Amino acid sequence: DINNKARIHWACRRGMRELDISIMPFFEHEYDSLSDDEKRIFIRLLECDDPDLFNWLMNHGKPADAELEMMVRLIQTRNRERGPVA
Amino acid sequence: MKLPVREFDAVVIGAGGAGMRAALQISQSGQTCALLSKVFPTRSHTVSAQGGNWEWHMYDTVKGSDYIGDQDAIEYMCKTGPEAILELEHMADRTGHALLHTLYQQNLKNHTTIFSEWYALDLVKNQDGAVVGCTALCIETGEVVYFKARATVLATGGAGRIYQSTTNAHINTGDGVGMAIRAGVPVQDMEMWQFHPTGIAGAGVLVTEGCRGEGGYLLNKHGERFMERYAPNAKDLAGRDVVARSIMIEIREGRGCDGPWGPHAKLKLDHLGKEVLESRLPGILELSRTFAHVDPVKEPIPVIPTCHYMMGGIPTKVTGQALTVNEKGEDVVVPGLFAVGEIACVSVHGANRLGGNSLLDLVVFGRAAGLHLQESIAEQGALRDASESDVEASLDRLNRWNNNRNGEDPVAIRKALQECMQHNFSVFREGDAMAKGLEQLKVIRERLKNARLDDTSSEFNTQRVECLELDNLMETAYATAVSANFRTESRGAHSRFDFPDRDDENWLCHSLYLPESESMTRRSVNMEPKLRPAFPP
Numbered sequence: 312d313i314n315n316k317a318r319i320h321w322a323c324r325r326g327m328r329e330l331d332i333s334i335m336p337f338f339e340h341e342y343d344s345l346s347d348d349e350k351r352i353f354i355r356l357l358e359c360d361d362p363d364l365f366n367w368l369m370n371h372g373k374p375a376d377a378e379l380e381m382m383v384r385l386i387q388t389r390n391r392e393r394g395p396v397a
Numbered sequence: 398m399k400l401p402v403r404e405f406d407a408v409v410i411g412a413g414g415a416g417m418r419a420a421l422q423i424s425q426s427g428q429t430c431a432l433l434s435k436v437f438p439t440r441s442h443t444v445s446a447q448g449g450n451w452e453w454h455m456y457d458t459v460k461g462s463d464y465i466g467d468q469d470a471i472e473y474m475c476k477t478g479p480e481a482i483l484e485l486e487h488m489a490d491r492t493g494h495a496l497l498h499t500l501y502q503q504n505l506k507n508h509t510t511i512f513s514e515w516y517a518l519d520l521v522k523n524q525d526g527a528v529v530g531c532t533a534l535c536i537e538t539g540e541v542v543y544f545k546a547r548a549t550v551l552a553t554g555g556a557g558r559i560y561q562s563t564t565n566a567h568i569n570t571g572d573g574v575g576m577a578i579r580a581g582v583p584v585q586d587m588e589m590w591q592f593h594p595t596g597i598a599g600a601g602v603l604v605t606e607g608c609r610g611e612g613g614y615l616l617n618k619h620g621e622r623f624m625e626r627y628a629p630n631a632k633d634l635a636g637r638d639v640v641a642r643s644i645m646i647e648i649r650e651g652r653g654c655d656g657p658w659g660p661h662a663k664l665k666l667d668h669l670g671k672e673v674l675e676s677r678l679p680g681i682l683e684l685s686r687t688f689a690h691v692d693p694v695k696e697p698i699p700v701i702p703t704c705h706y707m708m709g710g711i712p713t714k715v716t717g718q719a720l721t722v723n724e725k726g727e728d729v730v731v732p733g734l735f736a737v738g739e740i741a742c743v744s745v746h747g748a749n750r751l752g753g754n755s756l757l758d759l760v761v762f763g764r765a766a767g768l769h770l771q772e773s774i775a776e777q778g779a780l781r782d783a784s785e786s787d788v789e790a791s792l793d794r795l796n797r798w799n800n801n802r803n804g805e806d807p808v809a810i811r812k813a814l815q816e817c818m819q820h821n822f823s824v825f826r827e828g829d830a831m832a833k834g835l836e837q838l839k840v841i842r843e844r845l846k847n848a849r850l851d852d853t854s855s856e857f858n859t860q861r862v863e864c865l866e867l868d869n870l871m872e873t874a875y876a877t878a879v880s881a882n883f884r885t886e887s888r889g890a891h892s893r894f895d896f897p898d899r900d901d902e903n904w905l906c907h908s909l910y911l912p913e914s915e916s917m918t919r920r921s922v923n924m925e926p927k928l929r930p931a932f933p934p
């Protein structure tokens with residue numbers, strides 16, 4: 312359910328500070344700019360394990376899933392665009 | 398009971414390494430165990446841990462603790478450690494995640510009842526003052542349940558977010574500490590917070606001392622290499638206490654740099670040149686570009702002292718049983734309450750956690766709480782039922798949030814708390830600045846009592862959780878502050894500008910914050926190992 316934004320917001324609370332900075336602002340600022348397909352892909356990304364999410368975000372490997380890759384690239388691009396988190 | 402009641406032998410609040418190891422042991426002993434976690438267990442801050450003769454280990458730990466580490470607790474850890482770890486093997490790195498994954502899988506197998514995405518609110522007491530469970534909310538539905546228990550085990554982890562910069566995940570809001578405090582249960586050594594002098598400003602991701610080892614150095618807003626003033630010989634390679642303090646004096650006297658990272662000092666690396674940076678610090682280059690949004694090859698890395706580990710917490714026995722004191726100043730167990738992991742102060746870390754022992758204590762003392770639970774339940778005896786008003790007492794705080802839509806923004810209150818704590822109670826601790834700080838903290842906590850909750854919805858209301866978390870940051874911060882002002886010496890991670898020396902005559906002891914009067918006292922450091930003579934100071 313892509314409209315259940317409250318649910319997805321909780322899935323952005325991680326066990327690493329680096330992911331909190333990388334995912335929560337992205338979700339808060341960028342989620343509504345996403346298409347329906349992108350939104351579903353972001354939800355599936357958050358099911359992945361914290362150390363994988365960190366590594367992929369750091370260009371240390373990549374998921375074996377073309378959709379998740381483009382979502383990682385999206386988060387990276389958008390996070391570089393926003394600059395440091397207030 | 399108006400409120401729905403779920404009854405278990407044990408209720409474990411927290412599913413990191415410590416709480417999951419305990420829950421696995423409790424369930425393996427034949428007893429019914431509920432496991433509560435506000436996040437899915439593999440997203441506990443334990444996930445961030447990397448990297449993977451016992452008397453030597455003990456010695457290093459006692460020494461590293463600056464001799465307020467309890468020697469009996471440390472002996473138990475160092476002796477039992479290897480057995481404890483292999484028991485798990487017999488069932489960024491993946492070392493944190495694998496520990497969590499294994500313990501999660503095992504808990505399911507042994508029929509632990511897991512309550513994932515449930516938020517514990519407050520401990521439930523009976524008329525005798527024993528702990529008989531907690532109230533918790535289902536994050537999915539907003540349902541509130543009384544988890545009735547013979548043993549309630551706090552395993553909620555750290556609370557780095559009382560400060561402006563932490564390495565800790567944002568889930569680390571000191572909920573177990575707040576819960577203990579509001580129930581009247583004391584907390585120990587809350588001045589003992591491990592800081593790193595340089596985390597990335599606005600992130601908290603640590604920047605290795607190796608950057609300074611390689612020739613890097615710190616700048617203030619005028620480009621002055623200010624460590625030459627504070628440490629003429631050691632400069633930027635001075636003790637971490639000195640480098641960290643000096644950064645915060647600089648910030649608080651107005652010479653900090655600022656910008657979208659907030660206040661900071663600049664860690665200049667670019668004079669080293671491109672090839673040695675890429676050769677000798679290639680990780681720092683990628684960390685800086687991603688989380689500082691600067692390229693060290695061209696710009697300094699904005700940095701600030703950053704909170705890492707909570708050595709303080711709920712004082713416990715090796716058995717996990719939480720302690721308080723009576724008016725004779727003697728230890729007495731709090732019936733029905735237990736603590737394991739970073740939330741606890743068993744006190745294997747004393748005044749400074751030592752690398753690897755933070756994962757080790759999770760398993761050793763997680764397991765020990767589980768191993769001894771039945772005996773501990775037998776020790777406390779049958780506890781009287783909580784009455785309806787006992788349960789309603791544990792909902793009072795929640796109810797105040799749910800009846801305040803207009804009032805002060807909690808986000809602003811959180812930022813004010815964190816600034817106050819960072820300025821006055823992190824790495825710069827001085828008596829006059831702390832006296833002011835303590836009064837500022839009383840102002841901030843009067844404001845929290847008129848703080849609003851905008852979102853009145855029941856289902857996945859995160860704002861309500863974040864509000865409830867702030868009450869715990871506030872309690873954890875005030876306890877730390879009062880403790881820091883109390884200890885008039887410098888020992889380990891607690892560094893005082895006005896009292897720079899270690900004082901074993903007066904202060905070879907634990908600090909103990911007593912919530913009922915918010916006042917302080919001392920407690921003895923155990924100097925009585927069983928297998929081994931004591932290590933003297």
Ligand SMILES: *Cc1cc2c(cc1C)nc1c(=O)[nH]c(=O)nc-1n2C[C@H](O)[C@H](O)[C@H](O)COP(=O)(O)OP(=O)(O)OC[C@H]1O[C@@H](n2cnc3c(N)ncnc32)[C@H](O)[C@@H]1O
Nearest residue numbers: 411412413414415435436443447517553554738739753756
């Ligand atoms: C911050 C940090 C710490 C750390 C580290 C790297 C970072 C970035 N690397 C380490 C290392 O390499 N080696 C090591 O020995 N230690 C390292 N540390 C320290 C260590 O990892 C931690 O101190 C330790 O893992 C803490 O574990 P613990 O089991 O004590 O607690 P936790 O993992 O933080 O999990 C807490 C759980 O509690 C739940 N929770 C919190 N509040 C509530 C409420 N209100 N209700 C229900 N559940 C709650 C969380 O959901 C979590 O599961």
Ligand code: NA
Nearest residue numbers: 708709710739
């Ligand atoms: Na602790």
